[PDB]
Design an enzyme around this catalytic site. Structure first.
Site, PDB file in Angstrom:
ATOM      1  N   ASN C   8       0.963  -1.184  -0.027  1.00 39.97           N
ATOM      2  CA  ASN C   8       0.053   0.283  -0.162  1.00 39.97           C
ATOM      3  C   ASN C   8       0.949   1.316  -0.007  1.00 39.97           C
ATOM      4  OD1 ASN C   8      -2.648  -1.799   1.500  1.00 39.97           O
ATOM      5  ND2 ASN C   8      -3.082   0.113  -0.003  1.00 39.97           N
ATOM      6  N   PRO C   9       0.780   1.952  -1.009  1.00 40.61           N
ATOM      7  CA  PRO C   9       1.752   3.330  -1.021  1.00 40.61           C
ATOM      8  C   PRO C   9       1.086   4.414  -0.494  1.00 40.61           C
ATOM      9  CG  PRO C   9       0.874   3.081  -3.166  1.00 40.61           C
ATOM     10  CD  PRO C   9       0.132   1.806  -2.427  1.00 40.61           C
ATOM     11  N   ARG C  10       0.567   4.428   0.683  1.00 38.34           N
ATOM     12  CA  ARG C  10       0.199   5.165   1.437  1.00 38.34           C
ATOM     13  C   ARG C  10       0.348   5.207   2.881  1.00 38.34           C
ATOM     14  NH1 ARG C  10      -4.673   3.121   3.174  1.00 38.34           N
ATOM     15  NH2 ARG C  10      -5.350   1.428   1.821  1.00 38.34           N
ATOM     16  N   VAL C  11      -0.073   6.172   3.638  1.00 36.57           N
ATOM     17  CA  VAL C  11      -0.220   6.126   5.179  1.00 36.57           C
ATOM     18  C   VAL C  11      -1.562   5.416   5.546  1.00 36.57           C
ATOM     19  CG1 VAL C  11      -0.946   8.343   5.367  1.00 36.57           C
ATOM     20  CG2 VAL C  11      -0.408   7.335   7.507  1.00 36.57           C
ATOM     21  N   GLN C  12      -1.645   4.412   6.243  1.00 43.86           N
ATOM     22  CA  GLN C  12      -2.611   3.568   6.408  1.00 43.86           C
ATOM     23  C   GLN C  12      -3.483   3.985   7.599  1.00 43.86           C
ATOM     24  OE1 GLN C  12      -1.472  -1.041   6.243  1.00 43.86           O
ATOM     25  NE2 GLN C  12      -3.546  -0.860   5.514  1.00 43.86           N
TER      26      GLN C  12
END
Ligand SMILES: CC(=O)SCCNC(=O)CCNC(=O)[C@H](O)C(C)(C)COP(=O)(O)OP(=O)(O)OC[C@H]1O[C@@H](n2cnc3c(N)ncnc32)[C@H](O)[C@@H]1OP(=O)(O)O
Ligand SMILES: CC(=O)SCCNC(=O)CCNC(=O)[C@H](O)C(C)(C)COP(=O)(O)OP(=O)(O)OC[C@H]1O[C@@H](n2cnc3c(N)ncnc32)[C@H](O)[C@@H]1OP(=O)(O)O
Ligand SMILES: Nc1ncnc2c1ncn2[C@@H]1O[C@H](COP(=O)(O)OP(=O)(O)O)[C@@H](O)[C@H]1O
Ligand SMILES: [Mg+2]
Lengths: 95, 472, 191, 95
Positions: C8-12
Site C-alpha cells: 500500500n503506497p500510502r499512510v494507512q
C-alpha cells in the site's frame, strides 16, 4: 411449547411467572412486553410524573437502581415541524 | 477478597480511580454533594450516594462519618481518598482502617510522620538525606532572629502544617520578619489552628524536582523516575515536566537514589512523592506528600506504569515485582519526555481569580501523543465557586522535549473552552518562552518575566456574531 | 513461511499503533520527507537497530455498522457522545459529536480509539474499559461485537488468524442492553 | 497626546485614520469601538440578516474571512425566564 413460543416472541428465555402470565393473558402480556421494550420500566417514576409527564424548567430524580439516580431536567419544548415531530431539549445527568 | 472500591473525592481523580478499578475488575462507588450533583464523576461509577446533606460542599466532602457510613452501606471494601481532600488526614484514615475497610494509602505512622513538617524533617535528618538548614522547630520572634544572626540572610518563614503557598512567605530583614511572623501566626490560627512555624535558610532561584515512590508491604521500594515542577507562579505549580531535561542524568539518579533510600529507611508503602530543592548540584529535602500526585500522569507516561492501578494492587497486598509484574529498579524505562498543563478557570487578565459561569463550548484535542484527564468541563456545565477551578488537565508526551513542546502548543491552540475565562493564553505564553524550552526554569521564572502577561487580542468572531444575531 | 501479497503506497488507517509502539510520528515524518529532509539528520529519527518497541498497542475502528443487522451501516442523529480518556488512551475521532447527522454517502467510521501499554493483557483490559465507557446513542455501532472479539481467548492469546472471525459463531451472542435513560426520556417526552 | 489617549481608551495601537476619526467624532468612535468589542464585525452579514436577524430553522453562511465561512442555523427560541433572559439554541459549525 408455550415457553419456547414466548422465548422466541420476546427475545429471551422467560421464567415460570412470565409463561403463566402469557397463558392467562396472551395479547396483554405481549403488549406489556412491547411497551417495556419501548418506554422501559416506567414503574420507577413518581405518580404525577407518570401521569402528567413533565413541566417546563422542572427537575426530577428517578431511582432506576440502588445508587443510580437519573437527574432529568426539561429545558425547552420545541415547535412541531412539517413532519409533526417536536424536539424536546432535556438535561439528562447534567448533559 | 476485595470486590468493590469507594472514592472519597471528586472531579478528575475520581474518574481516574474509576478507570483504574474498571481495568482491575472492581466495582466503583462514588460520593457527591448536592452542589456537585452535575459532576461527571457521579455518573461514571456503578453506584453514587449523596453525602454531607445540609452542609457546605467542601465540608461535606470532609465528612468522615458520612463517607464511612456510605462505604459500609454500599458494601465497599476499599476507600481511595485521591488527593487534596482527605488523602493526608490522619483521623479519616484511622477511622477507615478501624472500621474494617482497606485504605488505599500509606500506613498511619507514615501519615503521622509526613503530615507535619517538623516530624518529617526529623525523620529526614535521621535518614541521612541532605536536608535544608533551618531552625530546630517551633521558634518565636527571637528564635527566628537567632537564625538570621548565626546562619545569615536571606531566610524564609514556613509553616509546619500549611501547603500550597499558604503558610509560607519570603523574609529579608528584621522588621518585615516581625510582620510576616505575626501574619503567619494569624493565618495559622485562622485557617488551621494549632500549627507550628519555622524559619529556614533561603535559596535563590531553585528547582523543584519531585521523585515518585512506589512500594508494597513486602519490602520492595521503587522510585519510578523524577519530575520537574519548577514552573511556579507564587509557589503554585503551573506546568510540570518529566523527566528534568535541564538536569544531568547522574544528578537525577543521585536524587532518585536519595529519595528511595529515605523511603526504604522509613519503610514507606503505596504511592508517595519526595520533593527536593535543587540549586547547583545540591538537593535539599523539603517535603513528602503521602499521596498520588495530580502531576503523576507525566510519570505514568515516561515510565510506562499505571500509578493508580499499582496503588490499588499494593493496597490489595500484592507483590510489586511478582503479582503486579513491575520490572526491577534498574530496568525501569525512561521513554520520552512528557509535559502536563492544568487548564483552570483562573483568568490571567483578572489577577488569576477563578471564573464562574456556563461552559457553552467545549472541544477536546486528540491525536498522537495526547492524554486527557478531563474533570467537569463539558458543554453546558455551570462552574461553581465552591470547588476547585480546574476544568481539564492535558499531557503531551514525545521522544524529544521540543516535540512535546510543539504538541502542547498545538493542543493549547486546538482547545476551545468558551463561556468562562481560562488560563490558556498564560500557558501559551509560558510554553513559547525560551527559558522553559531549554529546561532551565526556576521557581522565580514566572514572577521575573513580565513578558508572559502580554496576551494578544483574540477576535472570537463566532460568539460575537451569535450574540448580535440573538440580540437582533 | 511469510508470503508477499501487496504494497500500500500510502499512510494507512492503522498507523496509530505503530506510532504508539515506536514513538515516531508517521504523518510528521511523511511531511518532512516530502519537504526533502533527511531521516536520521534533519527529521532526527534514530538508526534501524535503535528503533524502540514500547509495549503493545491495540486499535479497533468504531463504525455505524449494526452487528444485529448484518453489519450494514446505520444512519441518523447522534444523541450522546462521551469520549473516554485516561492513561494509555489515544482517540482519533472523525465526525461523531453530539447532534451530528450521519449520512450514507461517506464511510461508516465514527471514532478510531487505540490503547497502548507495556503488556498486551493491560492493553486488552484498557480497550475493554474504553469500549464499555463509550456512549454513542442514536445510531447503532459495532461496540458489542468489538467487546465480544476482545473478550475472546484466542485474541488475548494473540494467535488469531484470518479465519478466526468466520469460525467463531459465539461472537454474535450480544447481551441485551437496557438503556434506561433514553427510554425514560422517550416516555417522558411522549407523556 | 490624542493618539496616546485613543490607545489607552481602546486598548490597542491605533492608526492615523483611527486617530483622525476619533478627533472629529469623539463619542461616535468610542460607541463604534464598544459595539465592535460587543458584536464584532457586523459588516460581513447580508442586509436582511443584518436588519431582521434570523428566522426559525433558517440556515445562513457568513464569510468572516477568506476560507472561513460560518454555518449558522437557528433551531429554537426559548421562552423568557423570570430574570428575562431568553435562550437561543443555535447550530454554529454543526455543533
Ligand atoms: C487541528 C489543529 O491542529 S488546531 C491548531 C490551531 N488552528 C486552528 O484551530 C484552525 C482554525 N482557526 C481558529 O479556530 C482561529 O483562527 C483561532 C485558532 C485563532 C482561534 O482563536 P479565535 O479568535 O477565538 O477564533 P476566530 O475568531 O478567529 O474564529 C471564530 C470561529 O470560527 C471557526 N473556524 C475556524 N476556522 C474556520 C473555518 N475554516 N471555517 C469555518 N469556521 C472556522 C473557529 O472554530 C472559531 O472558533 P468558534 O467557532 O468557537 O467561535
Ligand atoms: C470511568 C469508567 O471506566 S466507566 C466504564 C463503564 N461502566 C460504567 O459506566 C458504570 C455505570 N454503568 C453504566 O453506565 C451503564 O449502565 C452500563 C455501562 C452498565 C451499560 O448499561 P446501558 O444499558 O447501556 O445504560 P443504562 O441505562 O443501564 O445506564 C443508566 C443511565 O444512568 C447513567 N448512570 C450510569 N451509572 C450512574 C449512576 N451511578 N448514577 C446516575 N446515573 C448513572 C448511565 O450513563 C446511563 O445513561 P446513558 O444512557 O447516557 O448511558
Ligand atoms: N528555602 C526556600 N528557598 C526558596 N524557595 C522555597 C524555599 N522553601 C520553599 N520554597 C518554595 O515554596 C514552595 C513550598 O513548597 P513545599 O513547602 O515543599 O510544599 P507546600 O507548598 O505543599 O507546603 C516550593 O515550591 C518552593 O519553590
Ligand atoms: Mg511541596
Amino acid at each position: 411449547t408455550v415457553k419456547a413460543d414466548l422465548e422466541q416472541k420476546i427475545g429471551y428465555e422467560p421464567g415460570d411467572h412470565e409463561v403463566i402470565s402469557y397463558i392467562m393473558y396472551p395479547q396483554v402480556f405481549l403488549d406489556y412486553q412491547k411497551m417495556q421494550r419501548e418506554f422501559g420500566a416506567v414503574t420507577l417514576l413518581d405518580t404525577p410524573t407518570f401521569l402528567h409527564g413533565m413541566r417546563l424548567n422542572e427537575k426530577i430524580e428517578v431511582q432506576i437502581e440502588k445508587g443510580k439516580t437519573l437527574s432529568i431536567r426539561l429545558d425547552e419544548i420545541g415547535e412541531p415541524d412539517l413532519a409533526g415531530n417536536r424536539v424536546l431539549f432535556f438535561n439528562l445527568n447534567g448533559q | 477478597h476485595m470486590k468493590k472500591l469507594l472514592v472519597a473525592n471528586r472531579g478528575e481523580i475520581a474518574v481516574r480511580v474509576f478507570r483504574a478499578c474498571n481495568e482491575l475488575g472492581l466495582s466503583t462507588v462514588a460520593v457527591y454533594a448536592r452542589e456537585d450533583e452535575y459532576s461527571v464523576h457521579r455518573f461514571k461509577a456503578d453506584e453514587s450516594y449523596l453525602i454531607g446533606q445540609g452542609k457546605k460542599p467542601i465540608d461535606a466532602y470532609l465528612d468522615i462519618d458520612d463517607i464511612i457510613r456510605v462505604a459500609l452501606e454500599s458494601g465497599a471494601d476499599a476507600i481511595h481518598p485521591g488527593y487534596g481532600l482527605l488523602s493526608e488526614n490522619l483521623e479519616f484514615a484511622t477511622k477507615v482502617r478501624a472500621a474494617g475497610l482497606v485504605f488505599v494509602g500509606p500506613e498511619l505512622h507514615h501519615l503521622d510522620i509526613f503530615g507535619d513538617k517538623i516530624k518529617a524533617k526529623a525523620a529526614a535528618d535521621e535518614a541521612k538525606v541532605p536536608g535544608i538548614p533551618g531552625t530546630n522547630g517551633a521558634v518565636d520572634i527571637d528564635g527566628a532572629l537567632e537564625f538570621a544572626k548565626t546562619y545569615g540572610y536571606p531566610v524564609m518563614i514556613k509553616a509546619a502544617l500549611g501547603g500550597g503557598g499558604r503558610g509560607m512567605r519570603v523574609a529579608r530583614n528584621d522588621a518585615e520578619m516581625h510582620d510576616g511572623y505575626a501574619r503567619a501566626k494569624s493565618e495559622a490560627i485562622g485557617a488551621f489552628g494549632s500549627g507550628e512555624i519555622y524559619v529556614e535558610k533561603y535559596i535563590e532561584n531553585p528547582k523543584h524536582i519531585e521523585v515518585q515512590i512506589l512500594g508494597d508491604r513486602h519490602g520492595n521500594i521503587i522510585h519510578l523516575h523524577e519530575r520537574d515542577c519548577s514552573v511556579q507562579r507564587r509557589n503554585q505549580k503551573v506546568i510540570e515536566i518529566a523527566p528534568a531535561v535541564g538536569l544531568s542524568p547522574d544528578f537525577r539518579n543521585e536524587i532518585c537514589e536519595a529519595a528511595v533510600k529515605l523511603c526504604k529507611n522509613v519503610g514507606y508503602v503505596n504511592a508517595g512523592t519526595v520533593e527536593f530543592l535543587v540549586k547547583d548540584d545540591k538537593f535539599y529535602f523539603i517535603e513528602v506528600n503521602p499521596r498520588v500526585q495530580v502531576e503523576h500522569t507525566i510519570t505514568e507516561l515516561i515510565t510506562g506504569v499505571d500509578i493508580v492501578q499499582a496503588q490499588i494492587l499494593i493496597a490489595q497486598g500484592k507483590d510489586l515485582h511478582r503479582e503486579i509484574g513491575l520490572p526491577a529498579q534498574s530496568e525501569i524505562p525512561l521513554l520520552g519526555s512528557a509535559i502536563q498543563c492544568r487548564i483552570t478557570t483562573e483568568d490571567p487578565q483578572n489577577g488569576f481569580l477563578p471564573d464562574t459561569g456556563k461552559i457553552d463550548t467545549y472541544r477536546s484535542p486528540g491525536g498522537f501523543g495526547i492524554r486527557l484527564d478531563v474533570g467537569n468541563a463539558y458543554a453546558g456545565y455551570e462552574v461553581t465557586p465552591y470547588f476547585d477551578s480546574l476544568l481539564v488537565k492535558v499531557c503531551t508526551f514525545a521522544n524529544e522535549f521540543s516535540d512535546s513542546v510543539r504538541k502542547m502548543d498545538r493542543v493549547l491552540h486546538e482547545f476551545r473552552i468558551r463561556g468562562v475565562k481560562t488560563n490558556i493564553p498564560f500557558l501559551i505564553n509560558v510554553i513559547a518562552n525560551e527559558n522553559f524550552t531549554s529546561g532551565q526554569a526556576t521557581t522565580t521564572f514566572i514572577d521575573n518575566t513580565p513578558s508572559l502577561f502580554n496576551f494578544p487580542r483574540l477576535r472570537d468572531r463566532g460568539t460575537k456574531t451569535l450574540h448580535y444575531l440573538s440580540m437582533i
